[PDB]
Design a protein around this motif. Structure first.
Motif, PDB file in Angstrom:
ATOM      1  N   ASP A 244      -6.296   2.168   5.146  1.00 50.36           N
ATOM      2  CA  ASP A 244      -6.658   0.863   5.687  1.00 50.36           C
ATOM      3  C   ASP A 244      -6.155  -0.240   4.757  1.00 50.36           C
ATOM      4  OD1 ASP A 244      -7.864  -0.735   7.680  1.00 50.36           O
ATOM      5  OD2 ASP A 244      -9.745  -0.793   6.543  1.00 50.36           O
ATOM      6  N   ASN A 245      -4.832  -0.296   4.636  1.00 46.95           N
ATOM      7  CA  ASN A 245      -4.157  -1.296   3.828  1.00 46.95           C
ATOM      8  C   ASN A 245      -2.679  -1.213   4.152  1.00 46.95           C
ATOM      9  OD1 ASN A 245      -3.949  -3.418   2.033  1.00 46.95           O
ATOM     10  ND2 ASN A 245      -4.279  -2.174   0.194  1.00 46.95           N
ATOM     11  N   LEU A 246      -2.001  -2.342   3.992  1.00 49.52           N
ATOM     12  CA  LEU A 246      -0.558  -2.411   4.133  1.00 49.52           C
ATOM     13  C   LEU A 246      -0.079  -3.602   3.326  1.00 49.52           C
ATOM     14  CD1 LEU A 246       2.103  -1.554   5.436  1.00 49.52           C
ATOM     15  CD2 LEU A 246       1.455  -2.886   7.448  1.00 49.52           C
ATOM     16  N   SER A 247       1.056  -3.424   2.662  1.00 46.33           N
ATOM     17  CA  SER A 247       1.713  -4.524   1.978  1.00 46.33           C
ATOM     18  C   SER A 247       3.177  -4.173   1.778  1.00 46.33           C
ATOM     19  CB  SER A 247       1.065  -4.807   0.626  1.00 46.33           C
ATOM     20  OG  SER A 247       1.364  -3.764  -0.282  1.00 46.33           O
ATOM     21  N   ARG A 248       3.968  -5.215   1.544  1.00 44.18           N
ATOM     22  CA  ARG A 248       5.393  -5.047   1.302  1.00 44.18           C
ATOM     23  C   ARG A 248       5.654  -4.118   0.124  1.00 44.18           C
ATOM     24  NH1 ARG A 248      10.486  -6.942   2.258  1.00 44.18           N
ATOM     25  NH2 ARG A 248      11.622  -8.142   0.660  1.00 44.18           N
ATOM     26  N   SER A 249       4.907  -4.280  -0.971  1.00 44.50           N
ATOM     27  CA  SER A 249       5.122  -3.424  -2.134  1.00 44.50           C
ATOM     28  C   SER A 249       4.653  -1.993  -1.900  1.00 44.50           C
ATOM     29  CB  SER A 249       4.415  -3.990  -3.362  1.00 44.50           C
ATOM     30  OG  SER A 249       5.094  -5.139  -3.833  1.00 44.50           O
ATOM     31  N   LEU A 250       3.582  -1.794  -1.130  1.00 43.23           N
ATOM     32  CA  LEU A 250       3.151  -0.431  -0.834  1.00 43.23           C
ATOM     33  C   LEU A 250       4.309   0.383  -0.277  1.00 43.23           C
ATOM     34  CD1 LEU A 250       0.946   1.762  -0.385  1.00 43.23           C
ATOM     35  CD2 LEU A 250       0.625   0.709   1.831  1.00 43.23           C
ATOM     36  N   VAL A 251       5.082  -0.215   0.626  1.00 46.25           N
ATOM     37  CA  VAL A 251       6.206   0.487   1.225  1.00 46.25           C
ATOM     38  C   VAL A 251       7.403   0.500   0.279  1.00 46.25           C
ATOM     39  CG1 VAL A 251       7.735   0.593   3.208  1.00 46.25           C
ATOM     40  CG2 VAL A 251       5.350  -0.160   3.518  1.00 46.25           C
ATOM     41  N   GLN A 252       7.757  -0.667  -0.268  1.00 45.80           N
ATOM     42  CA  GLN A 252       9.009  -0.797  -1.011  1.00 45.80           C
ATOM     43  C   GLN A 252       9.008   0.040  -2.281  1.00 45.80           C
ATOM     44  OE1 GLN A 252      11.886  -2.215  -0.450  1.00 45.80           O
ATOM     45  NE2 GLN A 252      12.745  -1.965  -2.508  1.00 45.80           N
ATOM     46  N   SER A 253       7.838   0.201  -2.900  1.00 47.88           N
ATOM     47  CA  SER A 253       7.701   0.961  -4.133  1.00 47.88           C
ATOM     48  C   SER A 253       7.880   2.455  -3.933  1.00 47.88           C
ATOM     49  CB  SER A 253       6.291   0.763  -4.682  1.00 47.88           C
ATOM     50  OG  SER A 253       5.333   1.293  -3.770  1.00 47.88           O
ATOM     51  N   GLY A 254       7.889   2.926  -2.690  1.00 47.31           N
ATOM     52  CA  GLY A 254       7.882   4.341  -2.405  1.00 47.31           C
ATOM     53  C   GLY A 254       6.505   4.958  -2.371  1.00 47.31           C
ATOM     54  N   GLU A 255       5.459   4.173  -2.633  1.00 45.04           N
ATOM     55  CA  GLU A 255       4.113   4.737  -2.685  1.00 45.04           C
ATOM     56  C   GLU A 255       3.681   5.269  -1.326  1.00 45.04           C
ATOM     57  OE1 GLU A 255       1.176   2.291  -4.555  1.00 45.04           O
ATOM     58  OE2 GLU A 255       2.172   2.339  -6.511  1.00 45.04           O
ATOM     59  N   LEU A 256       3.950   4.528  -0.250  1.00 41.29           N
ATOM     60  CA  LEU A 256       3.507   5.006   1.054  1.00 41.29           C
ATOM     61  C   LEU A 256       4.182   6.329   1.396  1.00 41.29           C
ATOM     62  CD1 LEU A 256       1.734   4.556   3.508  1.00 41.29           C
ATOM     63  CD2 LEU A 256       3.672   3.418   4.604  1.00 41.29           C
TER      64      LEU A 256
ATOM     65  N   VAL B 221       1.162   3.459  12.587  1.00 44.21           N
ATOM     66  CA  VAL B 221       0.906   2.210  11.886  1.00 44.21           C
ATOM     67  C   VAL B 221       0.423   1.197  12.918  1.00 44.21           C
ATOM     68  CG1 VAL B 221       1.902   0.419  10.450  1.00 44.21           C
ATOM     69  CG2 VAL B 221       2.793   2.754  10.287  1.00 44.21           C
ATOM     70  N   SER B 222      -0.688   0.519  12.628  1.00 43.60           N
ATOM     71  CA  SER B 222      -1.290  -0.410  13.576  1.00 43.60           C
ATOM     72  C   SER B 222      -1.119  -1.862  13.147  1.00 43.60           C
ATOM     73  CB  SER B 222      -2.799  -0.170  13.719  1.00 43.60           C
ATOM     74  OG  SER B 222      -3.091   1.073  14.332  1.00 43.60           O
ATOM     75  N   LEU B 223      -0.793  -2.724  14.122  1.00 39.65           N
ATOM     76  CA  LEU B 223      -0.665  -4.170  13.953  1.00 39.65           C
ATOM     77  C   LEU B 223      -1.521  -4.858  15.008  1.00 39.65           C
ATOM     78  CD1 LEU B 223       0.692  -6.640  12.654  1.00 39.65           C
ATOM     79  CD2 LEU B 223       2.493  -6.478  14.341  1.00 39.65           C
TER      80      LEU B 223
ATOM     81  N   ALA C 291       7.955  -6.981   9.870  1.00 41.07           N
ATOM     82  CA  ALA C 291       8.851  -6.312   8.929  1.00 41.07           C
ATOM     83  C   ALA C 291       8.106  -5.258   8.110  1.00 41.07           C
ATOM     84  CB  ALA C 291       9.540  -7.337   8.025  1.00 41.07           C
ATOM     85  N   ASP C 292       6.885  -5.578   7.651  1.00 38.78           N
ATOM     86  CA  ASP C 292       6.104  -4.597   6.899  1.00 38.78           C
ATOM     87  C   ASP C 292       5.778  -3.394   7.780  1.00 38.78           C
ATOM     88  OD1 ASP C 292       5.914  -6.272   4.586  1.00 38.78           O
ATOM     89  OD2 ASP C 292       3.872  -6.896   5.074  1.00 38.78           O
ATOM     90  N   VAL C 293       5.391  -3.649   9.030  1.00 40.11           N
ATOM     91  CA  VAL C 293       4.998  -2.569   9.930  1.00 40.11           C
ATOM     92  C   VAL C 293       6.195  -1.700  10.283  1.00 40.11           C
ATOM     93  CG1 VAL C 293       4.149  -2.118  12.265  1.00 40.11           C
ATOM     94  CG2 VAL C 293       2.978  -3.754  10.800  1.00 40.11           C
TER      95      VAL C 293
END
Length: 352
Positions: free
Chosen positions: A18-30, A105-107, A82-84
């Motif tokens: 229950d979270n989303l951010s640009r860095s969560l994805v870009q960092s490879g963490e997701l 992924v929900s928006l 873009a994040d989604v």
């Protein structure tokens, strides 16, 4: 430890972040989470407000969008879509591996549309097309208008996360609208096997509303009892001959998704809601800190269907005390919409 996520999968429950951010994805963490057992992602306007305010990777994106003739809402949407889409790309392998049953992924649509069925349909169709990924769900509040919109969107083949449910009656209305949309598609010879809907039923907010004025033996118990009863309703609805006739033709059941499962009262263990609500064909979406706590000291056991008799007795005592859980549910949904609109206005102001 980390294997608890795969243990919960074996009990039939997906755990989403229950979270989303640009860095969560870009960092490879997701991407690493989607190998470690996380099975999807949910967002809402408050999640984006906090991400936009605190994640350094948005600064250049905002500066770029302030060079264009765009409304604050379209600046927000460009960022969020873009994040989604990036998160959907990370989750696609998982989604495809299960035949489209996981990895969503929900928006959420704009809160100001919550009582406008047509406007909600229009925005949801548009955001579905803008994201352009098969594993995106559009999140729609379960007002009466949202349940109208749900039927239309399902008949359009769009996957939906129906949110801000606090009521067993409203949840059953949502199942009936889903089934009508599915029946429409089957009658028209259209596919249904890739349409997935979740019913996001909120947990902690119920206990937060009631606990200070409840008797001892009920404090911290109502939200879990209400969810247990909702799950029993779910079993009864989706196994009935009416739905079985649709499932035989390829329809998917709606699945209950437990939301607001971070514990908000320090008197309760931080894993209370996750530990207590595990059952087959469900989802639990958890904030980061709750995911952490569950990995560290949660327990994987099929608790959701345990002691249903006690859940019923507790809800009977709630009614005996004069608490009408349907009145409460309507208030909590109203309050949640007001809060999401507040968060949305807060995030738009720096995008002017």
């Amino acid at each position: 430890g980390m294997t608890i996520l795969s243990d919960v999968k074996a009990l039939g429950q997906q755990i989403w972040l229950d979270n989303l951010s640009r860095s969560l994805v870009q960092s490879g963490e997701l991407a690493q989470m989607l190998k470690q057992g996380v099975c999807g992602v949910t967002s809402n306007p408050a999640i984006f407000q906090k991400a936009f305010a605190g994640d350094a990777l948005y600064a250049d994106e905002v500066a770029a969008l302030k060079r264009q003739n765009l409304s604050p809402k379209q600046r927000y949407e460009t960022m969020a879509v873009a994040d989604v889409r990036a998160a959907c790309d990370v989750c696609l392998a998982e989604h495809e591996s299960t035949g489209g049953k996981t990895g969503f992924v929900s928006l959420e649509v704009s809160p100001e549309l919550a009582k406008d069925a047509q406007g909600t349909v229009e925005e949801a169709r548009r955001l579905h097309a803008a994201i352009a990924r098969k594993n995106a769900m559009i999140k729609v509040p379960a007002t009466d208008a949202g349940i109208d919109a749900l039927e239309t969107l399902v008949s359009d083949g769009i996957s939906v996360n129906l949110t801000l449910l606090f009521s067993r009656a409203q949840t059953l209305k949502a199942y009936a609208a889903y089934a009508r949309g599915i029946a429409k598609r089957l009658a028209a010879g259209q596919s249904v096997a890739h349409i997935q809907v979740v019913a996001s039923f909120f947990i902690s907010r119920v206990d937060s509303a009631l606990d200070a004025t409840l008797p001892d033996r009920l404090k911290g118990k109502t939200a879990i009892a209400l969810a247990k009863a909702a799950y029993q309703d779910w079993e009864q609805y989706f196994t009935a001959p009416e739905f079985a006739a649709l499932e035989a033709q390829g329809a998917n059941r709606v699945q209950l998704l437990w939301a607001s499962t971070g514990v908000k009262n320090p008197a309760y263990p931080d894993t209370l809601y996750v530990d207590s609500l595990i059952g087959v064909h469900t989802v639990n979406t958890v904030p980061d800190a709750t995911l952490k706590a569950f990995i560290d000291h949660g327990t994987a056991k099929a608790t959701l269907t345990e002691s249903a008799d006690e859940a019923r007795a507790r809800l009977a005592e709630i009614a005996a005390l004069g608490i009408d859980v349907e009145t409460l549910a309507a208030r909590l949904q109203e309050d949640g919409l007001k809060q999401f609109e507040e968060a949305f206005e807060k995030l738009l102001a720096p995008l002017v």
